[PDB]
């Protein structure tokens, strides 16, 4: 049940020292620090000679930020833990979350702290009983950071917090961790281990199902009856992206819906991408204008993703606001649990930004534009997303 993580890294731990922690109870701290040397005690290259070293710092947060330690600082895990023990908690009257990830961003990482090694994966561990009140504003410092290629790990603990608002900062909504209380801490280490331990790249060569699951009512040709076709284009644009499709690389699958949903074709039907692009070209839109976003998940999730080890991504493409035959929430939800990337795009002004924010892996991964014929404005950084391949790396000690 204790693993470990074999990645070099630089990691910051991001360290709530509001005074809500000390009255809630006196040995809270003890607890919180306890947990942070298990996390220094689960990189194995912590605390190893030169190049090949992982390091660790330490930042304290609530009204405003204090810098316990720098990545420099110390040189082994027994250096570090002493480090961590002899941390003094300000108590801070405010919690000031997006400062915290500024000065994480601005300082923490720079090159005079230790940071800015390429060979290095950036990591963020954040830990809050509260919900942001004053300084910076988190989500806007958030996506500074993780633009910079860091990986943000969230963890909640009581009641205080905020999950949306932690959701909005981490790396993606199943990169935060939440608990009752301090005592049960530990019950979350092997969980941030195998997050930190996650890498994540830009690999359009990798193996990868990719599921379009689409609009298909009545409304898209409404005010335009080329509006269907540019979101094909957008489609097949994307498939050509990919160096390689089929079994031994990408597998595309598409899914539309209007009223109810239809799987169009599975992941196995098509090899090439002349089979895969005129696959989509040859889907007829339905007469009924409804938009059932909730059942093409379903059907996502039901008939195209039951191959292994393979990244799996869903783009949904919608120009209405869901119907409620199936619960968009409840089905992304499922999907991402099994390990669905959701990438959500909004189209016009039927759609509802707040149901694209509900599926998607990350409010990072939702993008809306006014028409169809700007769905090229958005194309690059729906690739990379497309693209992306993650791949678990923890194990056992
Ligand atoms: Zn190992
Ligand atoms: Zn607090």
Same mark, same amino acid.
């Given at each position: 049940?204790?693993?470990?993580?074999?990645?070099?890294?630089?990691?910051?731990?991001?360290?709530?020292?509001?005074?809500?922690?000390?009255?809630?109870?006196?040995?809270?701290?003890?607890?919180?620090?306890?947990?942070?040397?298990? *996390?220094?005690?689960?990189?194995?290259?912590?605390?190893?000679?030169?190049?090949?070293?992982?390091?660790?710092?330490?930042?304290?947060?609530?009204?405003?930020?204090?810098?316990?330690?720098?990545?420099?600082?110390?040189?082994?895990?027994?250096?570090?833990?002493?480090?961590?023990?002899?941390?003094?908690?300000?108590?801070?009257?405010?919690?000031?979350?997006?400062?915290?990830?500024?000065?994480?961003?601005?300082?923490?990482?720079?090159?005079?702290?230790?940071?800015?090694?390429?060979?290095?994966?950036?990591?963020?561990?954040?830990?809050?009983?509260?919900?942001?009140?004053?300084?910076?504003?988190?989500?806007?410092?958030?996506?500074?950071?993780?633009?910079?290629?860091?990986?943000?790990?969230?963890?909640?603990?009581?009641?205080?917090?905020?999950?949306?608002?932690?959701?909005?900062?981490?790396?993606?909504?199943?990169?935060?961790?939440?608990?009752?209380?301090?005592?049960?801490?530990?019950?979350?280490?092997?969980?941030?281990?195998?997050?930190?331990?996650?890498?994540?790249?830009?690999?359009?060569?990798?193996?990868?199902?990719?599921?379009?699951?689409?609009?298909?009512?009545?409304?898209?040709?409404?005010?335009?009856?080329?509006?269907?076709?540019?979101?094909?284009?957008?489609?097949?644009?994307?498939?050509?992206?990919?160096?390689?499709?089929?079994?031994?690389?990408?597998?595309?699958?598409?899914?539309?819906?209007?009223?109810?949903?239809?799987?169009?074709?599975?992941?196995?039907?098509?090899?090439?991408?002349?089979?895969?692009?005129?696959?989509?070209?040859?889907?007829?839109?339905?007469?009924?204008?409804?938009?059932?976003?909730?059942?093409?998940?379903?059907?996502?999730?039901?008939?195209?993703?039951?191959?292994?080890?393979?990244?799996?991504?869903?783009? *949904?493409?919608?120009?209405?606001?869901?119907?409620?035959?199936?619960?968009?929430?409840?089905?992304?939800?499922?999907?991402?649990?099994?390990?669905?990337?959701?990438?959500?795009?909004?189209?016009?002004?039927?759609?509802?930004?707040?149901?694209?924010?509900?599926?998607?892996?990350?409010?990072?991964?939702?993008?809306?534009?006014?028409?169809?014929?700007?769905?090229?404005?958005?194309?690059?950084?729906?690739?990379?997303?497309?693209?992306?391949?993650?791949?678990?790396?923890?194990?056992?000690?």
């Amino acid at each position: 049940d204790a693993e470990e993580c074999d990645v070099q890294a630089d990691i910051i731990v991001l360290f709530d020292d509001s005074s809500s922690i000390q009255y809630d109870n006196k040995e809270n701290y003890q607890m919180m620090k306890d947990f942070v040397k298990e *996390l220094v005690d689960s990189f194995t290259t912590v605390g190893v000679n030169g190049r090949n070293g992982s390091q660790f710092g330490v930042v304290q947060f609530s009204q405003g930020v204090k810098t316990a330690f720098p990545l420099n600082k110390f040189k082994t895990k027994e250096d570090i833990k002493k480090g961590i023990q002899d941390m003094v908690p300000r108590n801070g009257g405010q919690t000031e979350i997006g400062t915290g990830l500024k000065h994480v961003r601005e300082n923490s990482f720079s090159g005079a702290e230790g940071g800015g090694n390429p060979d290095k994966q950036k990591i963020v561990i954040l830990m809050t009983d509260g919900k942001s009140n004053a300084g910076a504003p988190p989500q806007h410092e958030a996506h500074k950071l993780k633009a910079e290629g860091v990986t943000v790990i969230a963890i909640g603990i009581g009641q205080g917090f905020v999950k949306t608002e932690l959701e909005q900062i981490a790396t993606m909504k199943n990169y935060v961790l939440t608990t009752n209380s301090f005592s049960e801490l530990s019950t979350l280490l092997k969980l941030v281990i195998d997050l930190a331990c996650e890498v994540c790249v830009v690999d359009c060569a990798g193996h990868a199902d990719i599921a379009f699951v689409f609009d298909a009512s009545s409304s898209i040709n409404a005010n335009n009856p080329n509006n269907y076709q540019l979101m094909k284009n957008f489609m097949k644009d994307i498939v050509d992206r990919f160096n390689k499709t089929g079994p031994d690389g990408t597998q595309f699958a598409v899914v539309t819906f209007a009223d109810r949903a239809t799987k169009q074709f599975g992941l196995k039907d098509y090899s090439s991408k002349a089979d895969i692009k005129g696959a989509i070209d040859k889907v007829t839109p339905s007469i009924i204008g409804q938009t059932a976003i909730g059942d093409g998940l379903e059907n996502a999730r039901l008939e195209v993703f039951p191959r292994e080890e393979v990244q799996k991504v869903v783009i *949904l493409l919608t120009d209405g606001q869901n119907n409620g035959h199936k619960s968009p929430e409840h089905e992304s939800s499922l999907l991402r649990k099994e390990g669905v990337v959701i990438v959500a795009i909004g189209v016009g002004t039927g759609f509802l930004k707040s149901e694209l924010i509900n599926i998607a892996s990350s409010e990072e991964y939702v993008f809306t534009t006014s028409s169809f014929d700007k769905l090229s404005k958005i194309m690059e950084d729906v690739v990379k997303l497309a693209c992306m391949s993650c791949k678990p790396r923890a194990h056992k000690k």
